[PDB]
Design a protein around this ligand. Structure first.
Ligand code: CLA
Ligand code: CLA
Ligand code: CLA
Ligand code: CLA
Ligand code: CLA
Ligand code: CLA
Ligand code: CLA
Ligand code: CLA
Ligand SMILES: CCCCCCCCCCCCCCCC(=O)OC[C@H](COP(=O)(O)OC[C@@H](O)CO)OC(=O)CCCCCCCCCCCCCCC
Ligand SMILES: CC1=C(/C=C/C(C)=C/C=C/C(C)=C/C=C/C=C(C)/C=C/C=C(C)/C=C/C2=C(C)CCCC2(C)C)C(C)(C)CCC1
Ligand code: SF4
Ligand code: SF4
Lengths: 107, 80, 41, 64, 143, 165, 41, 732
């Protein structure tokens, strides 16, 4: 209630030291507006170590997704009938994606 | 209506008459080109001035020229 | 009057002249122009 | 026979042409006596996108 | 063509529902256009002003408000089913005009039977300046 | 003391602006402990501000009625009075680089136009030749002068596309 | 490497290499030297 | 077939709504009218010029009548510094009870409108004192307007219609207009000044009853017939002189003191008296130059053909140009509009610095409105000059008539001129925006000393050359040893130096780096507008994209989507895009004038000096600080006198927004929307009985550009006029 959120720190290169505003808590930087501190307080997150672990896991999953795109195009590309299975796509993205994510977040 | 004129630079590619969706242009025999064809515009009063023939014209400059002015009930593309 | 002979208009003239040129003269203008445009030869 | 040599570079002096005061390569010259028998090809396209055009005998000269 | 054909009111029409795109009051006070084609079977075509309709096996009749609609339908039919159709023009007083195949061989051909019209033997850009034709009533390209 | 402008060293408004900046910078110093990284950054900012205010003074700089330094643009007036460093030498400093860029671009344009299908060289650059011209453009004015003199810089209008008016 | 270095000589050699070089160059002049106004060497 | 476009039979055959708009738009384009010759065209232009003269005289007669009727001219005469001018009374039946109560300004009874046109100061300076004289002026100007009406009708009947060659008589026209329209007209004006205004400023009423009984100078024309012209400049008005009474006055009719009146802050009456007398004499002398029926004189064709420099400097020189200017009416129109716009700019730049009317400088809002009005008028007139020059180039330019002359040679290297204009415009804009953004982001970082403040040494050097001793440049006219100061040291130097060394007036204000930066912005706007207008004029008849532009008329929409796309390819669209740049440029010059003068009047010139450098300071201290009183015209708490200006402000915003409506969207989507509306009207009950006679058709592309430009311009003008007069009238 007294310390403004801040998650972007500018460099002291040219006149930007005035942009590192006194957001409180012995810290200076850009007062952020995305509400990420509120989200990281909703999901139980205490230290910056857990944020570091989340960042590393996100980078790993991003590399996995890029490798998945490369594989699913260049290496093993699905046929047209695979994409035309609309019922399977709807079932797997209703029960699987949305429902499994909702259950995992509830847990 | 509008004025559509065809100059002697035409070489008879007979594609300006395909690009015109109003049957304004026609192909007549000629002797000034290798293809022995020349664009002619008998139904000039039916033209709206869409300049599709000028787009389809390959000669530089354009053999078929369309000049705007004196709009009518057929040159304005009016169905009402 | 002391040389009011370059005739001074009355102090009630706006009440007659403003609606005359705001309501009647535009009406005559629209009617005359609309008769002009829709005239076949 | 009546025009420039095939494959020789010529200069176009037609004012309304896109290639006025430009150099083009002759690809064919018609011998049937037509209005614009000289056919040339230009390395740069016009605004319409074409690269070839036809000119008369008096509209082509040897560039210096 | 060899003989100019007259349109027949007895030819049927393709099956189509009510479309708001179609004939207007201009079809009454002014001229309107009628397209005629012969089909070997029942096919589905898209109207230039509406949705999709099924043509009849044989002669067909379509009434369109503009000549551009008729030629768009003609080009669509020629590209799709090589129909080679023809369209007319019916005036308000009942006069029927023949427009598209005047020679019967389409504007793409020549037929060696049509004269040159609105053709300038001079080059484009060799026209005189507007000062030379000022106060004359004739444009430089109209010479 | 030209154009009614006092020197920056002997200007009261310049010192007023300096002490106002020092005051507003020291206002933020009271909210951090002296052994903190934001305190170190603010101290570095204050040191940079003091160094800038010191170096702008006694450097042939003038300011008038506002405390903000002014620049003298007329050459000659920047020569007899010590003001050439404002715009006189940096004009040639910019012009050298501008002619460098133009000359290396011109060299690449000529050396690419003499190659088969030369339109691809603009989207597909070559690095060795462009770097060779990049390190050969130091003497751009001499090359430009000699090319103007021999006539290869310009081209005959006869060979230039001209609007047909 | 031939196919890769043919791609690397397209748009990023002029859009990224020049941009990064000229930028970071100018950043380091503006960093190591303070903000100048008069060219007094 | 209709008959509303009687001038255009083809337009009357148009069955759509486009016929009305095109007939209104091509109303006075006589060169494109059906079946019209040159002589009838010239006679029609003569009658039209008579009509505009009658309209102008009727309008100024109405101004006199309304000021004499509902104004406070007598109260303004008694107290000019306190009593405000009144333009006309307000009779709006939609007004509320507070609205009537909030517009009885100037010590009036009913709702009145405060006059900022400057006619009160002008009429007080020229000797008009009572509303009786203004009434007589109004009725006389109405009479001469009727005379011009009858004369315009007179030169349309047979045996009275002038021939074509009468209009083409150039030498006699120039002789007569320069001798009488300028010379003897200025002589009559300085005679009126000496007879009426000089005694009326010294408590001596001169009217029609007694001007033959009073004498303008105590010597009485003896100096004029003799040589002793210095008797007129013997006893001028002293410094402690009142413009209404004869307190400390003198008997002088022609004097050259210079400077300003110490009380009225305006130029001396004897100064402008000798000015108009000298101008009259010089113009009458210059009016006896060109060749007429007598054996002496100058021939314009001979001078044009003779001025061909040797060695082919200009090729054929000005050979063949006399027939080019005489035959082409658009050339003469463009030259006249160019000179008129340039001299309107000169009038705007010289009125505020040298006020010729008593107590005009005290009225700040009036001076601001006058400057803004005449500057926008000048910009529009210059845009019209370049547009009509383009019309000359495409319509009636004959290259074989003048081969190798200056015109054909300029058209030959038109690409070089356009490219160099593009270079200077691009360079000015690049570096001006670069320095503005640099200074603005430097001021953002809390270090305003790092901004680039290039001192305007050139213009300050010029000001010191004119006698301004503030900058310390001891040049000529500022040092006592210079010959320019010694020459005229006893003529007008003590007045001019006293007026130019006083910073309270607007004569040669002190200029800082922000002044120089906004001057460069002004030069950028002028250069870019010149670039686009020049490129449109030179490419009006031919281009590499379209060589046959001369065959398509001056105002045609496009050539189609072929050859890449040819939208806005005509010179008409070049003018249409140039009007935006003209509006932006005059907006820049008026922003500069208004902010500098507002900071001068409020006394904080340092605020403008330290705030005009960066654009954020410009915005905050001009468009935000000065708009506080404007938008408080009608609060929910209450309404004041500035309620009309806030409504006009939002009105101009709305009209500018409708200009955007016509400008962004283009015709072709509106045609389908209108077609759907046509189907809606044709296929509904109780409304298909009512049917249009003109077919509804969307606005043409040229028409779309015209209406978008028109809405944009009127909205621009109205919102800026509202803001300017509200910010200058809210405080003073
Ligand atoms: C053309 C210049 C001009 C303009 C813009 C105005 C503007 C105004 N006048 Mg004024 N007026 C003028 C000239 C003008 N006047 C002249 C010359 C006279 C003396 C004959 C008057 C006599 C007059 C009276 C008596 C009254 C106004 C009023 C008004 C206001 C309401 C508008 C109105 O009713 O029109 C005025 C309508 C009239 C019929 C009078 C004008 C007669 C015209 C000028 C003669 C016709 C000339 C020509 C054929 C048509 C002119 C159009 C032309 C400009 C294109 C408005 C502020 C009224 C008001 O409330 O005062 C503020 C009012 O009561 N006017
Ligand atoms: C001492 C020798 C001398 C000199 C210096 C001149 C000088 C001049 N004479 Mg000449 N003259 C001389 C002897 C001389 N004269 C003699 C002995 C005779 C015989 C009696 C003449 C007869 C003569 C005639 C008959 C004429 C001249 C003219 C001229 C002028 C133009 C010359 C020219 O070709 O245009 C200069 C050459 C050009 C190619 C013009 C280029 C202009 C560029 C393109 C414009 C650049 C615009 C630029 C953007 C502006 C930027 C400004 C910025 C604020 C934006 C020039 C001032 C002409 C004149 O009166 O014009 C004023 C003319 O008609 N002369
Ligand atoms: C306020 C808005 C605005 C601005 C800034 C411009 C700016 C410009 N217009 Mg204009 N224009 C505008 C509104 C505007 N226009 C409108 C509303 C119209 C009516 C349609 C026109 C009509 C118009 C015409 C008809 C013409 C221009 C021309 C020009 C140029 C004039 C040359 C100049 O001054 O130097 C340059 C001025 C600048 C402001 C430079 C802008 C570029 C800066 C440096 C940023 C560059 C990118 C930056 C480094 C960041 C990189 C990353 C980023 C790209 C993502 C310039 C590019 C003329 C032209 O282009 O010919 C030379 C021209 O003929 N304009
Ligand atoms: C229950 C099974 C399941 C799940 C969970 C998903 C999940 C997803 N699919 Mg789907 N899909 C499925 C089965 C499934 N799919 C089936 C059976 C078919 C064929 C009928 C398809 C066909 C299909 C198409 C055609 C497309 C998708 C896409 C997507 C993504 C949508 C983007 C989104 O909402 O952001 C949610 C994003 C995240 C949660 C980020 C994490 C993503 C992780 C790494 C994915 C893990 C789920 C995966 C099924 C695990 C097994 C893969 C295994 C081989 C390693 C999402 C990741 C879109 C896509 O390409 O994105 C990949 C897309 O266009 N799906
Ligand atoms: C853009 C045009 C321009 C303008 C308006 C000025 C204006 C000025 N210059 Mg500069 N000058 C310029 C360009 C310009 N300069 C250029 C391009 C150079 C070449 C580098 C010079 C070289 C120069 C020198 C060497 C000197 C000036 C001086 C001056 C001043 C007095 C000049 C005078 O009285 O003329 C007199 C003219 C008589 C015919 C004045 C402030 C002088 C100065 O410092 O003034 C105190 C001085 O000594 N100027
Ligand atoms: C290096 C190539 C090059 C050269 C020598 C020129 C030279 C010229 N141009 Mg051109 N220009 C170029 C590239 C170039 N231009 C590019 C890429 C563009 C597109 C953005 C333009 C757009 C342009 C316009 C719109 C105008 C000019 C104008 C001019 C003239 C004024 C000088 C100037 O600084 O203009 C200013 C030039 C610019 C603002 C363009 C800057 C773009 C960068 C710096 C070019 C990058 C090229 C690259 C570094 C070369 C590759 C190097 C090689 C080793 C690989 C001059 C004839 C003006 C004119 O006609 O005056 C006579 C004019 O109005 N130019
Ligand atoms: C293109 C502009 C440019 C220039 C001229 C330099 C030059 C330099 N950098 Mg720098 N740097 C650049 C871009 C640039 N860098 C970029 C783009 C980044 C971000 C990735 C960095 C990040 C960076 C760091 C993190 C450090 C440097 C350091 C240095 C200096 C030591 C390197 C050395 O000895 O080289 C030869 C130099 C001859 C003068 C040197 C002056 C180091 C430093 O501060 O110096 C001790 C350092 O610690 N740089
Ligand atoms: C005294 C100078 C003068 C003269 C004699 C002419 C005369 C002519 N010009 Mg020129 N012109 C002038 C000034 C002048 N104009 C100015 C100042 C401009 C710049 C704005 C132009 C721009 C211009 C262009 C671009 C063109 C002409 C054309 C014409 C011709 C017919 C125009 C006409 O009457 O249409 C009558 C027009 C109308 C009745 C429309 C009036 C709508 C106005 C202009 C918009 C005003 C905005 C708004 C609605 C005003 C009311 C505000 C509201 C709140 C009350 C004629 C040869 C045209 C031509 O030669 O044809 C090819 C042409 O293309 N001129
Ligand atoms: C050198 C830095 C690294 C360059 C890498 C790329 C080289 C081209 C890659 C390439 O294609 O190399 C091939 C070729 C090799 O050069 P030579 O074998 O003739 O040796 C000359 C120089 O390259 C020696 O460095 O390079 C050139 O001809 C360009 C030389 C440019 C000039 C370089 C030396 C002179 C520098 C002078 C600096 C001060 C000038 C002051 C006045 C402006
Ligand atoms: C398009 C065209 C046109 C138009 C144009 C224009 C519109 C222009 C304008 C122009 C302009 C607008 C110009 C201006 C100019 C100016 C000047 C040229 C000035 C000068 C000045 C001076 C020379 C001064 C001097 C002085 C004195 C006297 C005093 C003080 C000092 C001094 C020394 C400064 C025309 C019609 C022809 C036709 C063709 C085409
Ligand atoms: S498109 Fe042009 S060149 Fe081709 S056949 Fe038609 S008129 Fe001739
Ligand atoms: S403008 Fe259109 S309708 Fe007219 S002749 Fe050309 S292609 Fe046909």
């Amino acid at each position: 209630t007294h310390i403004k959120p801040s998650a972007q720190v500018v460099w002291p290169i040219v006149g930007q030291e005035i942009l590192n505003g006194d957001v409180g808590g012995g810290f200076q930087g850009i007062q952020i507006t995305s509400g990420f501190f509120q989200l990281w307080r909703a999901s139980g997150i205490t230290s910056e170590l857990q944020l570091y672990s989340t960042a590393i896991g996100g980078l790993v999953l991003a590399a996995a997704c890029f490798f998945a795109g490369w594989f699913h195009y260049h290496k093993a590309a699905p046929k047209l009938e695979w994409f035309q299975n609309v019922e399977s796509m709807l079932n797997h993205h209703l029960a699987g994606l949305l429902g499994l994510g909702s259950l995992a977040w509830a847990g | 209506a509008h004025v559509v004129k065809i100059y002697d630079t035409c070489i008879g590619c007979t594609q300006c008459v395909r690009a015109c969706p109003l049957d304004v242009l026609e192909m007549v025999p000629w002797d000034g080109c290798k293809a022995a064809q020349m664009a002619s515009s008998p139904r000039t009063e039916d033209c709206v001035g869409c300049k599709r023939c000028e787009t389809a014209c390959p000669t530089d400059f354009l053999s078929v020229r369309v000049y705007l002015g004196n709009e009518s009930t057929r040159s304005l593309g009016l169905a009402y | 009057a002391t040389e009011g002979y370059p005739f001074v208009p009355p102090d009630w003239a706006p009440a007659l002249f403003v609606p005359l040129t705001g309501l009647v003269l535009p009406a005559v203008g629209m009617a005359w122009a609309f008769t002009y445009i829709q005239k076949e030869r | 026979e009546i025009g420039p040599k095939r494959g020789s570079l010529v200069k176009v002096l037609r004012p309304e042409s896109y290639w006025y005061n430009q150099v083009g390569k002759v690809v064919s010259v018609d011998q049937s006596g037509i209005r614009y028998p000289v056919v040339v090809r230009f390395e740069n396209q016009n605004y319409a996108g074409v690269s070839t055009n036809n000119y008369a005998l008096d509209e082509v000269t040897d560039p210096p | 063509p060899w003989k100019q054909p007259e349109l027949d009111p007895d030819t049927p029409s393709p099956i189509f529902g009510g479309s708001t795109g179609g004939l207007l009051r201009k079809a009454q006070v002014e001229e309107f256009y009628v397209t005629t084609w012969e089909s070997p079977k029942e096919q589905i075509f898209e109207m230039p002003t509406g949705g999709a309709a099924i043509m009849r096996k044989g002669p067909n009749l379509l009434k369109l408000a503009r000549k551009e609609h008729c030629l768009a339908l003609t080009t669509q039919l020629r590209t799709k089913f090589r129909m080679s159709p023809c369209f007319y023009r019916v005036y308000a007083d009942g006069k029927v005009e023949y427009l598209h195949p005047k020679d019967g061989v389409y504007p793409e051909k020549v037929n060696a039977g049509r004269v040159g019209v609105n053709q300038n033997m001079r080059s484009i850009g060799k026209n005189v300046d507007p000062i030379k034709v000022k106060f004359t009533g004739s444009e430089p390209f109209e010479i | 003391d030209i154009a009614g402008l006092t020197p920056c060293s002997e200007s009261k408004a310049y010192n007023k602006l300096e002490r106002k900046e020092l005051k507003v910078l020291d206002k933020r110093l009271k909210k951090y402990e002296p052994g903190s990284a934001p305190y170190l950054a603010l101290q570095a900012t204050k040191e940079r501000t003091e160094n800038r205010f010191k170096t702008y003074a006694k450097q042939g700089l003038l300011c008038g009625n506002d405390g903000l330094p002014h620049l003298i643009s007329d050459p000659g007036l920047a020569l007899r009075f010590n003001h050439a460093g404002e715009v006189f030498i940096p004009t040639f400093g910019f012009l050298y680089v501008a002619g460098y860029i133009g000359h290396v671009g011109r060299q690449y344009i000529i050396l690419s136009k003499e190659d088969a299908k030369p339109t691809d060289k603009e989207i597909i650059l070559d690095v060795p030749l462009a770097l060779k011209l990049a390190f050969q453009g130091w003497a751009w004015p001499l090359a430009s002068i000699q090319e103007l003199r021999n006539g290869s810089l310009l081209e005959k209008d006869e060979n230039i596309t001209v609007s047909p008016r | 490497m031939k196919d890769f270095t043919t791609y690397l000589s397209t748009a990023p050699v002029v859009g990224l290499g020049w941009a990064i070089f000229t930028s970071g160059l100018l950043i380091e002049i503006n960093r190591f030297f303070p903000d100048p106004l008069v060219f007094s060497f | 077939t209709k008959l509303f476009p009687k001038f255009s039979q083809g337009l009357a055959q148009d069955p759509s709504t486009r016929r009305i708009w095109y007939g209104l738009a091509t109303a006075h384009d006589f060169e494109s009218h059906d079946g019209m010759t040159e002589e009838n065209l010239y006679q029609k232009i003569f009658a039209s010029h008579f009509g505009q003269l009658a309209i102008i005289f009727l309008w100024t007669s109405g101004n006199l009548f309304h000021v004499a009727w509902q104004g406070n001219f007598e109260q303004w005469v008694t107290d000019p510094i306190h009593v405000r001018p009144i333009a006309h009374a307000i009779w709006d039946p939609h007004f509320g009870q507070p609205a009537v109560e909030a517009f009885t300004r100037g010590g009036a009874s009913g709702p009145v409108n405060i006059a900022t046109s400057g006619v009160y100061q002008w009429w007080y300076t020229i000797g008009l004192r009572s509303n009786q004289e203004l009434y007589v002026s109004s009725v006389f100007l109405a009479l001469v307007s009727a005379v011009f009406l009858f004369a315009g009708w007179l030169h349309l009947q047979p045996n009275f219609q002038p021939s074509l060659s009468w209009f083409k008589d150039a030498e006699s026209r120039l002789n007569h207009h320069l001798a009488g329209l300028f010379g003897v007209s200025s002589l009559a004006w300085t005679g009126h000044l000496v007879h009426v205004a000089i005694p009326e400023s010294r408590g001596q009423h001169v009217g029609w009853d007694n001007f033959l009984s009073v004498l303008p100078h105590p010597q009485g024309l003896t100096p004029f017939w003799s040589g002793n012209w210095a008797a007129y400049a013997q006893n001028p008005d002293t410094a402690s002189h009142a413009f209404g009474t004869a307190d400390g006055s003198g008997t002088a009719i022609l004097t050259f003191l210079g400077g300003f009146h110490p009380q009225t802050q305006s130029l001396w009456l004897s100064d402008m008296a000798h000015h108009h007398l000298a101008i009259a004499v010089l113009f009458i002398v210059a009016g006896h130059m060109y060749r007429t029926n007598f054996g002496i004189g100058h021939r314009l064709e001979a001078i044009l053909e003779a001025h061909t420099p040797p060695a082919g400097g200009l090729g054929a020189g000005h050979k063949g140009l006399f027939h080019t200017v005489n035959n082409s009416l658009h050339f003469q129109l463009g030259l006249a509009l160019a000179s008129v716009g340039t001299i309107t700019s000169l009038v705007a730049q010289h009125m505020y610095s040298l006020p010729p009317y008593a107590y005009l400088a005290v009225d700040f809002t009036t001076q601001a409105s006058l400057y803004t009005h005449h500057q926008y008028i000048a910009g529009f007139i210059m845009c019209g000059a370049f547009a009509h020059g383009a019309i000359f180039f495409i319509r009636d330019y004959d290259p074989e008539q003048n081969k190798g002359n200056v015109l054909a040679r300029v058209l030959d290297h038109k690409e070089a001129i356009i490219s160099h204009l593009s270079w200077v415009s691009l360079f000015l804009g690049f570096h001006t925006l670069g320095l503005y953004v640099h200074n603005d982001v430097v001021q953002a970082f809390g270090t305003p000393e790092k901004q680039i403040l290039i001192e305007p040494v050139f213009a300050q050097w010029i000001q010191a050359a004119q006698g301004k001793s503030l900058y310390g440049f001891d040049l000529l006219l500022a040092s006592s040893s210079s010959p320019a100061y010694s020459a005229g040291q006893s003529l007008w130097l003590p007045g001019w130096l006293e007026a130019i060394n006083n910073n309270q007036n607007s004569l040669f204000l002190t200029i800082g780096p922000g002044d120089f930066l906004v001057h460069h912005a002004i030069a950028l706007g002028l250069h870019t507008t010149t670039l686009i207008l020049v490129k449109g004029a030179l490419d009006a008849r031919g281009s590499k994209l379209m060589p046959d532009k001369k065959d398509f008329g001056y105002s045609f929409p496009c050539d189609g989507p072929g050859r890449g796309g040819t939208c806005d390819i005509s010179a008409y669209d070049a003018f249409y895009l140039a009007v935006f740049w003209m509006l932006n440029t005059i907006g820049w010059v008026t922003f500069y004038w208004h902010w500098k003068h507002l900071t001068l009047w409020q006394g904080n010139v340092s605020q403008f000096d330290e705030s005009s450098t960066y654009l954020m300071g410009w915005l905050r201290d001009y468009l935000w600080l000065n708009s506080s009183q404007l938008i408080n015209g009608y609060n929910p708490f209450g309404m004041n006198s500035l309620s009309v200006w806030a409504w006009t402000f939002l009105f101009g915003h709305l009209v500018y927004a409708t200009g955007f409506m016509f400008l962004i969207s283009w015709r072709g989507y509106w045609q389908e929307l209108i077609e759907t509306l046509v189907w809606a009207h044709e296929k509904t009950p109780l409304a298909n009985l009512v049917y249009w006679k003109d077919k509804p058709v969307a606005l043409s592309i040229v028409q779309a550009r015209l209406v978008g430009l028109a809405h944009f311009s009127v909205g621009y003008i109205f919102t800026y006029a509202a803001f300017l007069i509200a910010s200058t009238a809210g405080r003073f």
